[model samples]
Target: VRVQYLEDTDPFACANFPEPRRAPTCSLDLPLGAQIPAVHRLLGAPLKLEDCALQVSPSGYYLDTELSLEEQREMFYEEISKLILRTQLSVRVNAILEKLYSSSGPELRRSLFSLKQIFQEDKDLVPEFVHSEGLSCLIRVGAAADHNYQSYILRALGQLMLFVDGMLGVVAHSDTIQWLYTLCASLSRLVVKTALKLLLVFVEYSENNAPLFIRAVNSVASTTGAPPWANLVSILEEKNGADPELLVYTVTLINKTLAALPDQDSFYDVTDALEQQGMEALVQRHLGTAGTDVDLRTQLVLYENAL
Candidate 1:
């Protein structure tokens, strides 16, 4: 979490509910990150729900009662904020996830993006995130049928996935490869790069999955327009010196794309694009070195053959 204080909030829980005590004044907190107890289970005083007007489900949601929605939202934010202040994230973030799952529209999108940014800054939250079903939530949002929200969701999910485990197999089983397959061919350099970046992570978990990604590309490449391979090679030409990490991903993806072309025509398209872009000079500086490590050197070598 950020060292800086973003907000302050109060911790709200059902045990604090009226009931039980000041029944009319306190709203029974719908259990979110925390589990709720039976009316007779209220610690301080064992009383049945028949004793009160509000009847709460064992799951803690779906209560037959009147409540202020805004106040409830504020209370949730406040409660989550307090836990975060205490350095407790798994549950608090789970609480946030409740809101996230309920969130939609542009305002919701903005909030979700911000939540992801905050999530990445702190490693302390990983276990809680895992236990809280974080990956499932991310995948759900990443695959949600909204076009505009995808990049931001995928971007965050990709960045966060790097620090955690158990995400690849689950994400791999989803249409994410298909998503990246479609995205890596995008016109936006940022978009393509982000998709490729996530791909490297997917491969990190299971190298065998690389072929799935390759297949997705070929599926898209069958289109009439510029094949994904040549488009990426051209992108690599422009972004030659952006950053070591980006360059590595770019070069690796470019090579991978070239090697995976399903048809000779597609390979020719890649080779032709490289020739037009003068790949020899751009990657020439590194090609003659006889190679390196971490997939970057291998990519540079790919740039060499058609050198």
Candidate 2:
């Protein structure tokens, strides 16, 4: 008798036959110089070249590298000089240097005054030099996303604004001061929003993990200028103690937003678990909402008044 054959005869057969492919394996090799042609030409030279030499091992399997102290120092200096020159070519750096040396302040005031004197003495060439330097720096930062250098850029921007503020403050140039303040505020907001976007992306990928989210939040808070959220929390704390509704509305809004997101089981459950562990209360207290007796209306009025 002919036996009917079973289609699913393989013991290794899986219910999900086509499993997703794994991510591509990445090279662990450290980044080498970008100029491959230059490196190849340089490395192609005789084993003994100038003061530097490449020696073969006893087994002759691999090349050994060695450089004299003087050669090493020269290489280091050359690399550092290149970096410094590149930095000087950046617009942010020029803006920073200009503000530091051309604006008035107690410490930086002398530098600015001296620069102004020099410019006046060299009248014809000074403007072109300053303009060119400023343009170069602006081009570098304007072309790239400033995320990697946000903190440095922010500090420079802040100092530049402060310098401008001091100068305008001295001359009673209200319009200029206002304009500078507006520019500073706009720049600060952009940085903060970028930081917040980064935080949100981290949180989304963190998979309802509060600790990871908290770490990301703290990192953004610490790096992106002063802790703006902490300041907001402090203000909330002072008002919430006077009025209960202040905390209520703020917490409600946070809860509402959390409720609106996808994966209620995971996200909501994680939030509830955190709250059960008194994390919610901890955050509230951290914000300066320690007092438990404040009424809601009072808090609402306080918030409105502050606004």
Clash statistics: count for each candidate: 3, 8
Off by over 4 Å in 1: 1-40, 44-105, 115-151, 163-166, 169-171, 223-230, 237-247, 254-299, 302-307
After TM-score superposition, what is the CA distance of residue 35 in candidate 2 from its true location, in Å?
30
Least accurate 10 contiguous residues by lDDT in model 1: 1-10
Q: Which residue pairs show backbone clashes in model 1?
A: 1-122, 18-21, 90-128
The C-alpha lDDT values of all candidates are: 0.52, 0.33
Error of 1 at 131 (Å): 12
Span of 10 residues, lowest total lDDT, candidate 2: 1-10
User: Which RMSD values do the candidates have, in order?
Assistant: 12.5, 24.5
For 5-122, candidate 1 gives per-residue lDDT tens digits of 1121111121222322223222335433232223224333332223222222222222223343543543333343461112134345655677668867875687666656555654
Q: What TM-score would you give candidate 1 relative to the actual structure? A: 0.46
Model 2 residue runs over 4 Å out of place are: 1-215, 218-240, 243-249, 277-307
